[PDB]
């Protein structure tokens, strides 16, 4: 644990990137989190929503 | 069948042409909810039930 100050910064940045990547898996109330699934399943009036 | 004993049929291991369902004018109501009616020929499904 001698080099914990640099490793803390590295872990925080990697964890922020992992959270930002993980947030793509959430649909945020939509029917799916995948854009290709919505664009291949729905007409543009409801795919817009 | 009647609505209290509504008949459920499994559809599996077939290639389905839904374009004859959209282009037919015999249906008074043809309303899809989670999918566009014109994209049904472009997708693959399982657990299809009528």
Swiss-Prot record, chain A:
Substitution effect: residue 8 to N: In strain: Delta/B.1.617.2, Mu/B.1.621
Coiled coil: 7-49
Function summary: Subunit of the fusion protein that is processed upon entry into the host cell. Mediates fusion of the virion and cellular membranes by functioning as a class I viral fusion protein. Contains a viral fusion peptide that is unmasked after S2 cleavage. This cleavage can occur at the cell membrane by host TMPRSS2 or during endocytosis by host CSTL. In either case, this triggers an extensive and irreversible conformational change that leads to fusion of the viral envelope with the cellular cytoplasmic membrane, releasing viral genomic RNA into the host cell cytoplasm.
Protein name per Swiss-Prot or TrEMBL: Spike protein S2'
Residues of the full protein shown: 943 to 991 of 1273
Curated annotation (Swiss-Prot), chain B:
Effect of residue 21 to I: In strain: Omicron/XBB.1.5, Omicron/EG.5.1
Phenotypic consequence of residue 24 to F: In strain: Omicron/BA.2, Omicron/BA.2.12.1, Omicron/BA.2.75, Omicron/BA.4, Omicron/BA.5, Omicron/BQ.1.1, Omicron/XBB.1.5, Omicron/EG.5.1
Function of the protein: Attaches the virion to the cell membrane by interacting with host receptor, initiating the infection. The major receptor is host ACE2. When S2/S2' has been cleaved, binding to the receptor triggers direct fusion at the cell membrane. When S2/S2' has not been cleaved, binding to the receptor results in internalization of the virus by endocytosis using host TFRC and GRM2 and leading to fusion of the virion membrane with the host endosomal membrane. Alternatively, may use NRP1/NRP2 and integrin as entry receptors.
Subunit structure and binding partners: Binds to host ACE2. RBD also interacts with the N-linked glycan on 'Asn-90' of ACE2. Cleavage of S generates a polybasic C-terminal sequence on S1 that binds to host Neuropilin-1 (NRP1) and Neuropilin-2 (NRP2) receptors. Interacts with host integrin alpha-5/beta-1 (ITGA5:ITGB1) and with ACE2 in complex with integrin alpha-5/beta-1 (ITGA5:ITGB1). May interact via cytoplasmic c-terminus with M protein. May interact (via N-terminus) with host bilirubin and biliverdin, thereby preventing antibody binding to the SARS-CoV-2 spike NTD via an allosteric mechanism.
Name recorded for this polypeptide: Spike protein S1
Species classification: Viruses, Riboviria, Orthornavirae, Pisuviricota, Pisoniviricetes
Gene: S
Residues of the full protein shown: 348 to 397 of 1273
């Amino acid at each position: 644990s001698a080099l914990g100050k640099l490793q803390d910064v590295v872990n925080q940045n990697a964890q922020a990137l992992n959270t930002l990547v993980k947030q793509l898996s959430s649909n945020f109330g939509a029917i799916s989190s995948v854009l290709n699934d919505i664009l291949s399943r729905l007409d543009p009036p409801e795919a817009e929503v | 069948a009647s609505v209290y004993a509504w008949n459920r049929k499994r559809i599996s291991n077939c290639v389905a042409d839904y374009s004859v369902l959209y282009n037919s004018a015999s249906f008074s109501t043809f309303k899809c909810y989670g999918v566009s009616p014109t994209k049904l020929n472009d997708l693959c499904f399982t657990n299809v039930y009528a």
